[PDB]
Amino acid sequence: STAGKVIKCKAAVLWEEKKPFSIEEVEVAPPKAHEVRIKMVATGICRTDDHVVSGTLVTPLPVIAGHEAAGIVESIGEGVTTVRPGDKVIPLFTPQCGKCRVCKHPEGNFCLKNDLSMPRGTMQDGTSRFTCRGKPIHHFLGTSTFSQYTVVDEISVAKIDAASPLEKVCLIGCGFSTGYGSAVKVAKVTQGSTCAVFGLGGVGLSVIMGCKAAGAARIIGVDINKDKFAKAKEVGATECVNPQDYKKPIQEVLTEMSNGGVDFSFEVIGRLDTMVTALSCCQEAYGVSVIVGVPPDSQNLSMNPMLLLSGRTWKGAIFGGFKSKDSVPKLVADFMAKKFALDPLITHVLPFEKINEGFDLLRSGESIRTILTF
Amino acid sequence: STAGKVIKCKAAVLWEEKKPFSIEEVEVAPPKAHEVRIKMVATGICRTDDHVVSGTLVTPLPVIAGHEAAGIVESIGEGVTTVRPGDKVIPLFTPQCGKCRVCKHPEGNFCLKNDLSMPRGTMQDGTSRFTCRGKPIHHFLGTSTFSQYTVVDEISVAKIDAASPLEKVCLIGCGFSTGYGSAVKVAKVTQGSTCAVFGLGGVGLSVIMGCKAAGAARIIGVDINKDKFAKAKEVGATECVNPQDYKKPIQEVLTEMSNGGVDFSFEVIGRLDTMVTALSCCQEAYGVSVIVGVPPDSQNLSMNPMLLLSGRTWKGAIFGGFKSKDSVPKLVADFMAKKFALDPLITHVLPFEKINEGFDLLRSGESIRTILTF
Numbered sequence: 064s065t066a067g068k069v070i071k072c073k074a075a076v077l078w079e080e081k082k083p084f085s086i087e088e089v090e091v092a093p094p095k096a097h098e099v100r101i102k103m104v105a106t107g108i109c110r111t112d113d114h115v116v117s118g119t120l121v122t123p124l125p126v127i128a129g130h131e132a133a134g135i136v137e138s139i140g141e142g143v144t145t146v147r148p149g150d151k152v153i154p155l156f157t158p159q160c161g162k163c164r165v166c167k168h169p170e171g172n173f174c175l176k177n178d179l180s181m182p183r184g185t186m187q188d189g190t191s192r193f194t195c196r197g198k199p200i201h202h203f204l205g206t207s208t209f210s211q212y213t214v215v216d217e218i219s220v221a222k223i224d225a226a227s228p229l230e231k232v233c234l235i236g237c238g239f240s241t242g243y244g245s246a247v248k249v250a251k252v253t254q255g256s257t258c259a260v261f262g263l264g265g266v267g268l269s270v271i272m273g274c275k276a277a278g279a280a281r282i283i284g285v286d287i288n289k290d291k292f293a294k295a296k297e298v299g300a301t302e303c304v305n306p307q308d309y310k311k312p313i314q315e316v317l318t319e320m321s322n323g324g325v326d327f328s329f330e331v332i333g334r335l336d337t338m339v340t341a342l343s344c345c346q347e348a349y350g351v352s353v354i355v356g357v358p359p360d361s362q363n364l365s366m367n368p369m370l371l372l373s374g375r376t377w378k379g380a381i382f383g384g385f386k387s388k389d390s391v392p393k394l395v396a397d398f399m400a401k402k403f404a405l406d407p408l409i410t411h412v413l414p415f416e417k418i419n420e421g422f423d424l425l426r427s428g429e430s431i432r433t434i435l436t437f
Numbered sequence: 438s439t440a441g442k443v444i445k446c447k448a449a450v451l452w453e454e455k456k457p458f459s460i461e462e463v464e465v466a467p468p469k470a471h472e473v474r475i476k477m478v479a480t481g482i483c484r485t486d487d488h489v490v491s492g493t494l495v496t497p498l499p500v501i502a503g504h505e506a507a508g509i510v511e512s513i514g515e516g517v518t519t520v521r522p523g524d525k526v527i528p529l530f531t532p533q534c535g536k537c538r539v540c541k542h543p544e545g546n547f548c549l550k551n552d553l554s555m556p557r558g559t560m561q562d563g564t565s566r567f568t569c570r571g572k573p574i575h576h577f578l579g580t581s582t583f584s585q586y587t588v589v590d591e592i593s594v595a596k597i598d599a600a601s602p603l604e605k606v607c608l609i610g611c612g613f614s615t616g617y618g619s620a621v622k623v624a625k626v627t628q629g630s631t632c633a634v635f636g637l638g639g640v641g642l643s644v645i646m647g648c649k650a651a652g653a654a655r656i657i658g659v660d661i662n663k664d665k666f667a668k669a670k671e672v673g674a675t676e677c678v679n680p681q682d683y684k685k686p687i688q689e690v691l692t693e694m695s696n697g698g699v700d701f702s703f704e705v706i707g708r709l710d711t712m713v714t715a716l717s718c719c720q721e722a723y724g725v726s727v728i729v730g731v732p733p734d735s736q737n738l739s740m741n742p743m744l745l746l747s748g749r750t751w752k753g754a755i756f757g758g759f760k761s762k763d764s765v766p767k768l769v770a771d772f773m774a775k776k777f778a779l780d781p782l783i784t785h786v787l788p789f790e791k792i793n794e795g796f797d798l799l800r801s802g803e804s805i806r807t808i809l810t811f
């Protein structure tokens with residue numbers, strides 16, 4: 064009854080930076096060739112979406128944000144072969160076109176069709192499927208999940224298990240997979256190692272989950288909000304430290320605690336200074352540091368390259384290094400088989416209409432993941 | 438005639454920065470417990486030794502520099518078990534104590550007994566074996582090879598094949614092993630890959646040798662001195678580019694040539710700007726960049742962490758990542774078995790007394806490696 068037709072629905076439109084989202088009616092065009100229109104079931108609030116509001120992450124406005132979500136296919140455009148109406152799906156903020164040099168590389172996952180490096184805020188064809196008050200509205204990372212319906216390119220959606228609980232598995236679309244993969248796939252944490260995790264939000268807790276799964280003997284959580292420590296220990300941290308408690312810089316503290324530096328460190332905040340601190344606290348000859356946090360737009364850090372010359376490895380990754388369309392269904396299957404848990408990340412649940420309250424909870428430090436239900 | 442006694446011999450003393458080496462008589466104490474006195478045969482002129490003269494690398498002065506060398510054991514102190522009088526040896530500017538956490542780690546080679554991080558310019562016991570004009574003279578990296586005799590700690594010397602040609606294998610003490618290992622062990626260049634090498638001196642040519650040995654399909658040499666290109670092609674470069682020939686920054690040129698970025702890049706110069714350019718020119722999702730060059734003392738580079746967040750890996754290494762005492766004898770044996778060539782690196786051979794002329798050849802751009810003979 065809606066196939067081929069414009070759908071009018073509610074969405075959370077961001078008209079300008081540093082303002083509440085506006086819950087109001089938008090028009091969602093039907094999918095074109097190789098596009099998929101999705102009815103949203105649940106979406107999480109990730110710090111990246113707040114970065115859009117704050118101007119930390121620059122993408123064209125006005126915009127429908129949201130990128131960590133799950134829903135049910137409402138209709139498919141001409142030529143779609145990988146999903147069907149009625150399928151449960153997770154939108155992929157990093158596409159997997161399967162044809163570019165990165166998709167063909169055994170390690171790479173940052174597909175060249177991404178909308179991150181040179182943000183356009185469009186579908187792959189350079190146009191928008193959203194109208195609001197008669198005005199075109201930008202997409203976000205080819206997902207735009209803060210809406211009752213969205214349209215994504217086929218390379219930006221994965222079919223998942225038909226029995227999946229969408230109010231939980233939406234976290235596999237961003238925060239869980241990012242943190243878990245950063246530990247198990249990017250860093251390749253080893254049994255018996257010592258790890259340090261900077262930032263104990265949804266993504267940092269997922270890093271801890273991955274470090275424990277990889278068998279780390281010590282996992283040191285680092286956060287300036289000590290209210291985050293109890294859940295960090297629940298999911299695997301052996302000891303938590305607040306940098307504000309110490310007179311010395313925390314990388315000196317962590318080097319002392321690890322008897323000369325940690326094996327693996329992770330920056331999961333998004334600050335230039337903590338990226339450098341995290342690199343410095345890994346052991347100078349064989350340590351590995353992974354950047355996960357998003358830096359403020361266009362800003363450069365400063366560092367002494369002797370930190371690298373002694374032997375450190377420094378790297379970063381999007382989405383935990385996972386090839387998105389191959390990996391998301393497998394991660395869902397693994398969740399259904401109880402191989403990892405998502406409940407520890409979910410601290411609050413709200414209806415989509417209370418999106419602004421959900422962002423207030425994030426900004427206040429009270430929440431990890433709030434899940435919004437449509 | 439000389440065991441247990443002070444040796445008066447010729448050495449090249451550096452009394453202060455930015456002055457020629459002073460060829461004069463020095464006095465070399467006999468070895469104490471666990472020390473080894475070596476009567477040098479050949480020593481190479483490495484850019485690192487020039488960095489001491491120029492103030493790029495800070496180490497206590499006055500000093501006997503030189504660290505890339507080979508000689509013959511004159512005497513051993515109490516407790517030495519790994520070499521004997523008459524053995525051919527190569528001093529190790531990175532020690533291998535075998536006891537610290539780095540030596541025990543499968544990947545690490547930057548032994549915690551090194552004299553680089555906190556330069557003292559002494560023997561392990563904190564004292565000097567050198568006097569000149571009645572003044573104590575500092576050691577350099579526990580080697581000090583610009584002298585007819587030196588004294589090193591046992592952890593800083595390796596015994597090598599009694600039939601080795603010392604006037605060639607001295608290069609295994611630094612330049613060859615550093616460059617070759619940076620490609621084959623640190624970067625782990627893969628066959629069919631595309632590589633970019635910034636700096637075509639002795640170390641950069643050794644990187645090229647390693648990239649070719651690893652089966653790279655394309656090896657792009659980068660140098661502002663085009664006189665370096667002919668030898669780079671002889672040892673495996675498929676193409677050479679001079680940044681000053683182009684209106685665009687060279688990272689953009691290299692990204693275009695490689696159809697979107699190289700697989701492996703190497704900075705083998707020692708400039709902050711080329712360290713960042715080398716990182717930028719590897720492919721953003723799966724590229725690897727290795728810093729080999731020595732940066733100017735205490736200076737920080739500036740970089741955008743988005744270069745790492747997309748997926749790049751940035752690392753550095755001392756001595757090609759080789760565990761020094763284990764690897765040097767094996768590299769000499771490999772040379773004797775004809776597994777790699779050293780002659781392409783040697784452009785000049787001069788008597789030790791012509792040390793200053795040898796440094797003039799390096800500074801003028803004319804030489805690769807000058808070997809000084811005693």
Ligand SMILES: NC(=O)C1=CN([C@@H]2O[C@H](COP(=O)(O)OP(=O)(O)OC[C@H]3O[C@@H](n4cnc5c(N)ncnc54)[C@H](O)[C@@H]3O)[C@@H](O)[C@H]2O)C=CC1
Nearest residue numbers: 110111262263264265266286287288332333356357381382
């Ligand atoms: N690389 C990727 O693919 C992805 C990156 N991100 C980024 O990861 C970061 C974390 O995301 P979430 O976990 O949702 O964020 P979050 O805000 O829930 O967690 C961040 C934690 O860092 C702590 N923190 C803040 N400043 C600190 C400081 N100076 N020192 C120590 N701790 C400090 C906060 O108290 C907070 O608990 C964000 O920057 C986000 O944009 C998120 C998802 C995917």
Ligand SMILES: NC(=O)C1=CN([C@@H]2O[C@H](COP(=O)(O)OP(=O)(O)OC[C@H]3O[C@@H](n4cnc5c(N)ncnc54)[C@H](O)[C@@H]3O)[C@@H](O)[C@H]2O)C=CC1
Nearest residue numbers: 484485615636638639640660661662706707730731755756
């Ligand atoms: N990491 C380690 O273990 C080691 C590091 N090193 C360092 O490696 C570096 C290279 O050593 P060598 O080969 O002996 O030096 P070299 O001076 O013979 O070679 C350097 C090359 O860089 C080129 N160059 C200079 N500025 C340039 C620019 N802006 N762009 C492009 N090319 C430029 C020069 O023309 C020269 O050919 C030095 O900094 C040295 O201290 C050396 C040995 C061991």
Ligand SMILES: O=CNC1CCCCC1
Nearest residue numbers: 109111130156237357381
């Ligand atoms: O949180 C999801 N996506 C992020 C990934 C890191 C760059 C900004 C967008």
Ligand SMILES: O=CNC1CCCCC1
Nearest residue numbers: 483485504530611731755
């Ligand atoms: O060239 C020999 N040794 C160098 C290695 C890099 C740091 C300075 C000393």
Ligand SMILES: [Zn+2]
Nearest residue numbers: 109111237238
């Ligand atoms: Zn996210």
Ligand SMILES: [Zn+2]
Nearest residue numbers: 160163166174
């Ligand atoms: Zn692709």
Ligand SMILES: [Zn+2]
Nearest residue numbers: 534537540548
């Ligand atoms: Zn050691």
Ligand SMILES: [Zn+2]
Nearest residue numbers: 483485611612
């Ligand atoms: Zn050297």
